[PDB]
Amino acid sequence: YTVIVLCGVALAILVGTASSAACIAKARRDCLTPYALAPNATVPTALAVLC
Amino acid sequence: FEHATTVPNVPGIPYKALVERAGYAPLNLEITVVSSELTPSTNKEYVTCKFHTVVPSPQVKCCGSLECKASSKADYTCRVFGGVYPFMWGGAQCFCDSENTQLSEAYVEFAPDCTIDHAVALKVHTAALKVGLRIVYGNTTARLDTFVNGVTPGSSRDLKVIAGPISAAFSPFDHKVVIRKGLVYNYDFPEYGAMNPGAFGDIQASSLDATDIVARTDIRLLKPSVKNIHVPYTQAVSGYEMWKNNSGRPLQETAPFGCKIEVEPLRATNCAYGHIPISIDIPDAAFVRSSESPTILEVSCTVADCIYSADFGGSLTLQYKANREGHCPVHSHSTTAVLKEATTHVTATGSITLHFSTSSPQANFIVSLCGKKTTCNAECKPPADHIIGEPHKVDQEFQAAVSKTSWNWLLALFGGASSLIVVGLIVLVCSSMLINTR
Amino acid sequence: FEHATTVPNVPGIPYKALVERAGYAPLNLEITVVSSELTPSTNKEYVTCKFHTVVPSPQVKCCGSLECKASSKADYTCRVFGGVYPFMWGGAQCFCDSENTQLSEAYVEFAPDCTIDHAVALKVHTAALKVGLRIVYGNTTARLDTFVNGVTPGSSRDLKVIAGPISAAFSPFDHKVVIRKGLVYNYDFPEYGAMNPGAFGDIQASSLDATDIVARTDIRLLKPSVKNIHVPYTQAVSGYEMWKNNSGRPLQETAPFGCKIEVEPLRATNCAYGHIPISIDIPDAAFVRSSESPTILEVSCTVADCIYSADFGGSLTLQYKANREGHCPVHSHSTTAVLKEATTHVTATGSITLHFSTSSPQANFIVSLCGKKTTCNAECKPPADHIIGEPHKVDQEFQAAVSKTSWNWLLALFGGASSLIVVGLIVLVCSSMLINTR
Ligand SMILES: *[C@@H]1O[C@H](CO)[C@@H](O)[C@H](O)[C@H]1NC(C)=O
Ligand SMILES: *[C@@H]1O[C@H](CO)[C@@H](O)[C@H](O)[C@H]1NC(C)=O
Predict the structure, then answer these.
(1) Is the peptide bond preceding residue C383 cis, with omega within 30 degrees of 0?
(2) Does the entry annotate any disulfide bonds, and if so which pairs (chains B, C) (predicted)?
């Protein structure tokens, strides 16, 4: 029984980390999706959040 | 008042319960299963044992002709022989060159010692179980012995108690059984009227002293080939002896749950499987009004030390404040932990120590002192000694072995990553709205 | 040689079969089930009968005090009463103004005539079936009686014959039965130890003459209320009498398949249901080489008239040409029809009739005369009478009631529209090609 709980915990944490990484990467891409070269940076706070 | 319970069907494990009714102080109720008795219904099929081949004096019809004749004795085998020439210590018993003939017959019967060495085959069905209960209430003891079936009552010592059918049925006996010299064996004995030489049940009889016997054991005669008179017989080895040699272990060393099997009723006793639903009716007279019962105030727990031991080894202390001298009950309504004593004296401000047992390390529960309740918790450690044969697991484990620390670790590890992906989608739609604004 | 068959378990319906061996003329084999015998295993639960209330003289104490005392008698009831003042024809039996006290007790015992009116409750199980078979082969008759189980060959002439097992188990008896004065009733009697007033089995005893009895019948005493001395008792009406009044019809008039139920063994007899597979072993010496068997030539059927009757009413004739005088067997391998005699004398050019029965209006089949076969057919008509109580349906109907004319009408019934649609498709493709050429 004890082996199952650890494996399930590892699976859950891995799935959560992967989902969070994918979500944050997609959010960064959407924020960076516009080329933004014609004007300056929309807001430096958004740039800081991005990186 | 009628009050029901489910009690484990295991000897020497008292069960404590209460009875709640407005206006009357709680009354302790102790139930003990003194000993079980599973007696099945059986019918005698037949009896077999070592046999003995009779060899009656051969008939001689000499210088003549003779013919074989059948009979009614079991396994009767007959045969004539011509050209024989009997001789005896006196000399030639007749006078003719091979014209004589001799008739030889053989049959079988159970040996005298069988009168005590018999092995009888039985067919069993519809196992029934009887339970002896001892009940204690209001420091008064009552007896009863009832069949676990619910239609039958048991009235004893002012009380009539009705049992309920076992939850899960146990029946160590198989459809076929053999009993011999006080030993029970699980074996598929041949059906009556089916004889196979060199195997159990080669000789069969309805009763030990039944004049009628049916049996075939492959007896074949041989033509005399010696000077003197002698009937040579040949037969297979006795089946009963062969079964005795390799009968295997008896049922005492194989019955599950350690059922002590006695012979003269052919019944098992003192062995545990399943639970008994049992309803107790209690006279209203035995109950006591709460008005005269002691009144308690400001009850408090304290766990000096508790050991997660198989044997009852946990300790506890209670401090109360009351006004009336008397006796009050005590109980632990949490099934995980079981107390030791039910009733205790009560003083104005006295404290009393209690003993208990638990099956989980996180020993937390609510204890009822007299008419009032009190929650309390503590942690117990495993014991040094890990093998002991005294009453253990008064309550079966309920996945409560998980301590609060383990739960805390498991909960803390998990994080809201689903919320994180939801926030990712939210910021995606927000970025879409931002593009709209742009 | 060993030869197997399936026979309908039903008395008075002979079954004819053959055994085929190269170089041996066919041997008839007739099997008859003389009488069925179904005996189940039973145990004695208890016995009951009309009871009788014992009203022993009341214990009177003059100018004193007295108390009740319990006893071991079944249904024992006690009660004391103060203020008694018994009187008799002589006068007062005590002299003090209400100090005296009278104790009255009561118990119940089975009535004497019970010895013959007793009703016994039984539990039955594991029905076992016994068959009596009579087998005729080569104008030699033999008998046997065997358990239906196919593992206990019967003994007859030191011959082993195996029967069964039954295709579908049948037992008119229920789990719980009761028996009284030669009549069996199907009833759900209360289990031993459970007494209900005004119902069957209120008085229960292990044996008729058992000193130990357990029973309750709601006996309540009444305070004395008349000048003289008496112990007024009130009790519910006897349960056994009430059960007798409305017991319902016995099992003799409800058992399916017309089973005759005898009491002493408590077993059913002479009643038919299901099929029996049976294997018969015949000694080789019984067989006769075909060399000595009569030789037949140019066999021919002729159905003078056939009646589609329940009984054996169909007629047939056979014309044969042979060379050797003797007896030849005759049979009908078609299950739909069964002949009357198995063998007949054979002459050089004789012709002989035969009586047969059939279960269809179209009576066509192959009849084997001695070693040779002969097909032949005829049409039978229904009989004038339509209700008789003689062995009927020696062969069960096999949806063969359809007549040849009915089959011809069915054949003329169907119509081939599939050909029409196929022609339509063919002309469709051809006309599509033509339209392309248009
Ligand atoms: C049982 O407990 C009650 C409660 O106080 C007490 O009055 C009674 O005397 C006790 N009975 C015995 C036999 O000690
Ligand atoms: C039985 O039939 C055979 C064959 O014809 C015959 O030889 C024999 O005599 C018959 N036995 C009896 C007893 O009729």
Answers:
(1) no
(2) 49-114, 62-94, 63-96, 68-78, 259-271, 301-376, 306-380, 328-370
Confirm if B316 and B299 have CB atoms less than 8 A apart: no
What lies within 8 Å, CB to CB, of C25 at 6+ separation is C287, C288, C289, C290, C293, C328, C329, C370, C371
Q: Which of C233-243 are b and which e, b meaning 16 or more Cβ less than 10 Å from the residue's Cβ?
A: eebbebbbeeb
Measured from the CB, is residue B14 less than 6 Å from ligand 1?
Answer: no
Tell me the three state secondary structure of residue B167: coil
Q: And the tokens for C40?
A: 């189940």
Q: Which of C123, C149, C194 sits opposite B151 (nearest CB)?
A: C194
Q: Does B256 touch chain C (CB under 8 A)?
A: no
Ligand 2 atom with the shortest distance to the CA of C327: 5
- Between strands B176-180 and B183-185, the pairing is antiparallel
Q: Are B221 and B231 in contact (CB under 8 A)?
A: yes
Q: Tokens at residue C168, please?
A: 């579908």
Contacts across the B-C interface (CB distance below 8 Å): 43
Residues of B in contact with A31 (CB under 8 A): 427, 431
Sort out which chain A residues have CB atoms less than 8 A from B415's CB and list them.
13, 16
Residues in chain B with CB shorter than 8 Å from the CB of A26 are: 424, 428
DSSP state of B190: P
In three state form, how does the secondary structure of B391-437 look?
CCCCCCCCCCCCCHHHHHHHHHHCCCHHHHHHHHHHHHHHHHHHHHH
C138 Cα nearest atom in ligand 2: 1
Closest CA to C136 of C6, C309, C15, C261: C15
Size of interface A-B (CB pairs under 8 A): 49
Any idea which residue has 């092995």 for tokens?
B119
CB contact under 8 Å between A30 and B432, yes or no, is yes
Phi, psi of C242 (to 5 degrees): -65, -40
Structure tokens at C268: 């059913």
The beta-carbon neighbor of A16 closest among B415, B424, B428 is B415
Chain B CA closest to residue C194: B152
Q: Method of determination?
A: cryo-EM
